[model samples]
Target: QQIKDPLNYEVEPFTFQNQDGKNVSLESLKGEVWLADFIFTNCETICPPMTAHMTDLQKKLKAENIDVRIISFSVDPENDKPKQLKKFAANYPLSFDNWDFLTGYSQSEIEEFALKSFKAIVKKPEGEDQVIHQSSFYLVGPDGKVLKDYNGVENTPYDDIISDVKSASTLK
Candidate 1:
């Protein structure tokens, strides 16, 4: 039941540093289901609500005794430094035990990972302070393959996501 070559893409070993300067990799999260989403520290619009909703989902998962992890990648890695990301995550009150706010990768590397690994779009406008990116939260299986893409703003269906995570985790 191992996920060999999931989603028709050969998953690569992508690495990034967390807000605390700790290296994070897909291998580091083996044997766990983790949710991933793209966000920036300075985003004023959808990012805030997106994170808050995810935090709510985290709480529900914890109450249900679920062991899913959360991985948030910064689209504006140039500005969302480790310290900034740490501060930003502090404001959201995410469960640090299962959540990691990650940055410290090159801007181009983040963009490439967005496009190649998660298959999401990320673009920085010329002379602008904001980044344009997708708003779907990806559900990744324990074997590091994407399972589902949930709309970031909709928190109602998060229970379904938790169910999917449970299904993926027990696939072996």
Candidate 2:
């Protein structure tokens, strides 16, 4: 379910290394509509399905000729490097053109960013093999403000997301 009124939160400045080992920054993504989510390769649950759903969203964006970027931040930065992120992304039918899987940050850095930017929770419990994180996909407007959140796992509202992207693009 979406918030009755869309909340706008500015994304903090960041420069993180992407799956291609290239620097991707908030400055670079400014003025573009983008979607973001948190994921990790080693997760035994949730992540795989979320990745697949995002891939499907990407295909729909392409089909609709909608220009937008997709960003996936690794919740487990220590274990999920650029190489690992790249390999993990290979399982999906994703286009590199507008998609970036990012890492190269400390665990605390990402946890802070997630909370500050998207108001999402990301944590790795003590002595646990899995990280805890939100499974919501975020839609960011061209102004680099978070616009809406949608379920990234089961029962994703694909139509709502696509429609929102189309609507958001008109604001540019």
Candidate 3:
């Protein structure tokens, strides 16, 4: 059953390389609730604070012993490889034990997948080093469906997110 708010987009199956260059597939996330977002290391705007906010949320979840995975999709897969992801992620405070910053797909794959799954966009214009992506944090239910989204950068609802996850975990 869905909580108060719902977006209800089903997440497609995927297998991508994590920041450690290890493979993490969707099957590995079965029966778990998770967070999802798209960003790039070469970002010139928006993404930095989004990542920071996510890290903060991660901390809150950990301290409360809330079990939820955080999946960050690298919009610029070409340059935001595993090494680049690790280097960029070092700027934030998070334990990657239940979090994965993913890449290893091609540009088109991410661009297409973002839209197909969450109706988001990821693109880099020609001659531009920066990639453009949305800043919403998607909340995926244990059934692999996106329950809702939040503004990851501004006015993030940490309590609301935590509350939802806390309640959602009891579903099983």
lDDT of 3 by residue, 1-172 (tens): 3477678887888999999989988788889989988777875443457788899999999999998999999877888889999998888878889999999999988888889888887675343442234468988888888888888867999999998887667758
lDDT of 1 at 162: 76
TM-score of 3: 0.90
lDDT for residue 41 in candidate 1, whole number 0-100: 78
Under the 3 Å rule for N, CA and C atoms, how many clashes does model 3 have?
0
Candidate closer to the true structure by lDDT (higher is better), 1 or 3 = 3
Q: Which residue pairs in model 3 clash with each other?
A: none
Task: Give the candidate order by descending lDDT.
Answer: 2, 3, 1
The true-versus-predicted C-alpha distance at residue 148 of model 2, in Å, is: 0.2
- Residue pair clashes in candidate 1: none
- Enumerate residue pairs that collide in model 2: none
* Distance from true location, Cα of 27 in model 3, Å: 1.3
Quote the positional error of residue 101 for candidate 2 in Å: 0.2
